[PDB]
Ligand binder design. Structure first.
Ligand SMILES: *[C@@H]1O[C@H](CO)[C@@H](O)[C@H](O)[C@H]1NC(C)=O
Ligand SMILES: *[C@@H]1O[C@H](CO)[C@@H](O)[C@H](O)[C@H]1NC(C)=O
Ligand SMILES: *[C@@H]1O[C@H](CO)[C@@H](O)[C@H](O)[C@H]1NC(C)=O
Ligand SMILES: C[N+](C)(C)C[C@H](O)CC(=O)O
Ligand code: NA
Length: 530
């Protein structure tokens, strides 16, 4: 049985068929760029304080002093969850006394925001935080919302992989793409916080599923030369485009419902891909469905205007796979044997440590000095050079050395955050941007590495499993802001240390550079051990 690459060598690397698949699978990823980090604006927290109803016709002086002031970052600003006792203030106002001149504010009774909160309109007109007052006693629900979204991503990564490796890749791709769009649509008409969180979980669950499905399907369809280009300058750059345009929508649309409408609509256009994206012939050949693979190959050859040979498969090849048409694979196969088990463990460690840093930096943009939209754009913008560098490294360098260098750069850049002077914010900003650049390059490369390592029989399952354990860090990523209380530089120290320690581990992975994609568990590379 000749390798799939040799069987379809006559189609050529570039042509109408490959070009169409390349750009339609790349286009599918823009909605993922929109959705992945939308929580930055949908779950923003505008400045707030207790509302004092206008019914209480307090004196002007008292309406200057209805709320205690506090040292929030040394800025003398109103307290966000307390007010002076309204009845007492009204009584003093009626009696004629005024703050300071007659009543000492230090002795005034304080009470919670009984009449709600007034959110500032300077940045956001409305978000879910303002919609359901996820502030003060309920401030923990926002990071909980993001954590649940990443939990949905975890579940999607786990399930979609097995579903795809069982019932093909096109079906799962389209089903979960429709899931993402549909459950994004319902969120607009959300009426309760609980329904919103459920829908958000489902949205993430479809989002990651269809991202991975498109990535794997394109990796299998396209040839060796264009595989790396598709992986790096394709899916990842189109993701970067979506992520860069997200803040553009946010800038002109300050309402979370309208913003969600804008973000969801462009994903609807993906329906047109059904009549053009075919099932992976590699996967079909693996499952033993030779007729469908042959039909797809003949269609592709006709598209490119290439005369098909007399027979795609030598009869001997057809009889060879008769025995392999019977067996089946499941999750337990990734741990049945020693070699695949070790590969899986190392891949899980790589993915977890990379994603920790990636989503730690990505979600931290709001806290950075300067305009939120500009910071978000810069965070998205810096990715494109990262993917170009990833492309170059995968093309011209061994996987191990390139991954080690990328991780080492990302870790070392962050680890030095403590040395920045206090007043030089821009130095910290560029350090964070360079760390993001390195971690993004590493994340782009790890996808290709994992895809190459696993065989086609369990390729999607393997990538999904690796992505599943990856989201543990993302789940706790929103809570890094809490850790900042202990020390501002501590989270950067931890991310850098984790990345540096990872970089060493990468040297033990098998070298897959310049190696054809395996098709069976007995063809994958052997770890340097048993
Ligand atoms: C009361 O607050 C207004 C703004 O709402 C401010 O311009 C004014 O100076 C304040 N008055 C006093 C007496 O502090
Ligand atoms: C209003 O303030 C005056 C002056 O301190 C006090 O004597 C009176 O009891 C207060 N009334 C209420 C209802 O708190
Ligand atoms: C507030 O308005 C009410 C009528 O709504 C009036 O009786 C009362 O005297 C006003 N209070 C003050 C302090 O002027
Ligand atoms: C960052 N990038 C584009 C490499 C990956 C996507 O966010 C998908 C994922 O979360 O794995
Ligand atoms: Na997509």
């Amino acid at each position: 049985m000749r390798d799939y690459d040799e069987v379809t060598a006559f189609l050529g690397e570039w042509g109408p068929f490959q070009r169409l698949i390349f750009f339609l699978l790349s286009a599918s990823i823009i909605p993922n760029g929109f959705t992945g980090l939308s929580s930055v604006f949908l779950i923003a927290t505008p400045e707030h304080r207790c509302r004092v109803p206008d019914a209480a016709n307090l004196s002007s002086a008292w309406r200057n002093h209805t709320v205690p002031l506090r040292l929030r970052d040394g800025r003398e600003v109103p307290h966000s969850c307390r007010r002076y006792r309204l009845a007492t203030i009204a009584n003093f106002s009626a009696l004629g006394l005024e703050p300071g001149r007659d009543v000492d504010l230090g002795q005034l009774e304080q009470e919670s925001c009984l009449d709600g909160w007034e959110f500032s309109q300077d940045v956001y007109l409305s978000t879910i935080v303002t919609e359901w007052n996820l502030v003060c006693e309920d401030d923990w629900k926002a990071p909980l919302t993001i954590s649940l979204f990443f939990v949905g991503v975890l579940l999607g990564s786990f399930i979609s992989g097995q579903l795809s490796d069982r019932f093909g890749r096109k079906n799962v791709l389209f089903v979960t793409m429709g899931m993402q769009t549909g459950f994004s649509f319902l969120q607009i008409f959300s009426k309760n916080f609980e329904m919103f969180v459920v829908l958000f979980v489902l949205v993430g669950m479809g989002q990651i599923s269809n991202y991975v499905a498109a990535f794997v399907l394109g990796t299998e369809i396209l040839g060796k030369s264009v595989r790396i280009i598709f992986s790096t300058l394709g899916v990842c750059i189109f993701y970067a485009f979506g992520y860069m345009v997200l803040p553009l929508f946010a800038y002109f649309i300050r309402d979370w419902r309208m913003l969600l409408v804008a973000l969801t609509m462009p994903g609807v256009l993906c329906v047109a891909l059904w009549w053009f994206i075919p099932e992976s012939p590699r996967w079909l050949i693996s499952q033993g469905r030779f007729e469908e693979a042959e039909v797809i190959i003949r269609k592709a050859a006709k598209a490119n205007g290439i005369v098909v040979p007399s027979t795609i498969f030598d009869p001997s090849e057809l009889q060879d796979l008769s025995s392999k048409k019977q067996q089946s694979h499941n999750i337990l196969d990734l741990l049945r044997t020693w070699n695949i088990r070790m590969v899986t463990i190392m891949s899980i460690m790589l993915w977890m440590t990379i994603s920790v840093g990636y989503f730690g930096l990505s979600l931290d943009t709001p806290n950075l000095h300067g305009d939120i939209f500009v910071n978000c754009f810069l965070s998205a913008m810096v990715e494109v050079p990262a993917y170009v560098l990833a492309w170059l490294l995968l093309q011209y360098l061994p996987r191990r050395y390139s991954m080690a260098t990328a991780l080492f750069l990302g870790g070392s850049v962050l680890l030095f955050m403590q040395l920045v002077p206090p007043d030089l914010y821009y130095l910290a900003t560029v350090l964070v941007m360079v760390g993001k650049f390195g971690v993004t390059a590493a994340f782009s490369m790890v996808y290709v590495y994992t895809a190459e390592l696993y065989p086609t029989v369990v390729r999607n399952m393997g990538v999904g499993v690796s992505s599943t354990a990856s989201r543990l860090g993302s789940i706790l990523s929103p809570y890094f802001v809490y850790l900042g209380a202990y020390d501002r530089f501590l989270p950067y120290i931890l991310m850098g240390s984790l990345t540096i320690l990872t970089a060493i581990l990468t040297l033990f992975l098998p070298e897959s550079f310049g190696t054809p994609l395996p098709d069976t568990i007995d063809q994958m590379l052997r770890v340097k051990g048993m």
